[PDB]
Amino acid sequence: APFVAPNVQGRVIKESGYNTKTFKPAYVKPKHVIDPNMIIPRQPGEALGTG
């Protein structure tokens, strides 16, 4: 607090305000194409020979 000789008025004290933060979320979009070149070939569980 300010020391102020009691013979005088007093001292005016300043203030401070405040702030805000604002954010937009980002966007994510992966995809696969699944044409036959991927469906046909033998997958690991398939028996050798026939499948």
Binding site: P30, V33, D35, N37, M38, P41, R42, L48
Partner: protein
């Protein structure tokens, strides 16, 4: 081819890697035409002055020759005189396709299909 093997042993039977041709979702569209040269699967093709499919050959000429403007992507391989099915529309993974020499980077591989229904781009 007659005998079995009784002795023990190891064998690396083989490996499989998928080939992904499509890199997007345009309307995939195809056509068929006579080939003028030996064309491999997913080779990029042009049409020569006689209207026969020929593998794409940029800098063919001093006026540029019609082989120099790509027109599609071979869907199955063919020898000269046979019919080639080929894509004329769709979005294609540049890596899977067969390219001319010196057509190295994706920045160049796109320039071949800007004015066209085909568009060529990277996979992720």
């Amino acid at each position: 081819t007659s005998l079995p093997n009784y002795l023990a042993g190891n064998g690396d039977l083989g490996s499989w890697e998928p080939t992904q041709i499509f890199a997007g979702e345009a309307d995939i569209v195809t056509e068929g035409g006579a080939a003028g040269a030996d064309i491999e699967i997913y080779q990029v093709i042009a049409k020569n002055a006689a209207g026969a499919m020929v593998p794409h050959d940029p800098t063919a000429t001093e006026v540029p020759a019609p082989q120099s403007v790509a027109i599609g992507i071979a869907a199955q391989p063919a020898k000269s005189g046979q019919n080639v099915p080929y894509y004329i529309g769709g979005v294609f993974n540049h890596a899977a396709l067969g390219w001319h020499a010196s057509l190295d980077t994706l920045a160049k591989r796109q320039a071949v299909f800007d004015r066209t229904n085909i568009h060529i781009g990277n996979l992720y």
